[PDB]
Amino acid sequence: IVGGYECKAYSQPHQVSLNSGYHFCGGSLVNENWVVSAAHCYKTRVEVRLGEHNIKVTEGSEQFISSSRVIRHPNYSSYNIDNDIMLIKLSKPATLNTYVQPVALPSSCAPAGTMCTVSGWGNTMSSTADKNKLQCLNIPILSYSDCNNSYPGMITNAMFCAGYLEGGKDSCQGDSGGPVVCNGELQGVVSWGYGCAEPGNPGVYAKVCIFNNWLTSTMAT
């Protein structure tokens, strides 16, 4: 997260860290047995770390749970990152508490201008922001017109832009797969963008609100 502020510890209880030796992507707990992330973060197996604030030190609220299933969206394509969404089933249910809580799926699609929160342990491009601690940032959803204008022909119906065309505030590598929450619902998944926080290059996110059926259907399994 570039240009944000440190999240208060456990203020984003749905935020999870996908770990394979080291943190490599974010994710969002949507129920005790399932986590939503980006398809490009895929691995046959991954360790889900919940209840994290500082990912380098044990703080007592962590729960490390190995995956039992990793399911990429059937229409995910690596050539353009279309349908960059994925579900991770936990081998054992997460124990919900004050530090670990699921985030609701969208009950509607958030329109342009809606303010959201994006968080993660990715690149901060800062010499003062402790990258080991969960970073927070508020970003508004941009219109499709702004999105396509920024990335001509690269935006599908499964993507939306959020952030500021002026630059300075954006998510970044390492935040990938992480949450974009607006009005208490998971509207997006950190996916891609040109560089980070660059003017005219806003962040692009998987549009969770058009995947409700696939998500619900898949979680029945």
Known binding positions for Ca(2+): 52, 54, 57, 59, 62
Q: In the complex, what is the shortest distance from the CB of residue 60 to Ca ion, in angstroms, rounded to a whole number?
A: 8
Q: Between 57 and 115, whose beta carbon lies closer to Ca ion?
A: 57
- Let me know if 53 is a catalytic residue: no
Q: To the nearest 10°, the Cα dihedral for 72, 78, 82, 84?
A: 40
Q: Cα(41)–Cα(23) distance, rounded to whole angstroms?
A: 11
- Let me know if 176 is a catalytic residue: yes
Among 40, 67, 82, 119, the active-site one is 40
Which residues of this protein are in contact with Ca ion, per CB under 5 A?
Answer: 52, 54, 59
- In the chain the first and final C-alpha atoms are separated, in Å, by 33
218, 137, 203, 214: which is closest to 173 by C-alpha?
203
Distance from the Cα of residue 104 to its chain's centroid: 14
Q: Between 49 and 207, whose beta carbon lies closer to Ca ion?
A: 49
Q: Between 60 and 111, whose beta carbon lies closer to Ca ion?
A: 60
- Let me know if 14 is a catalytic residue: no
Among 23, 53, 84, 119, the active-site one is 84
What positions carry a catalytic annotation? 40, 84, 176
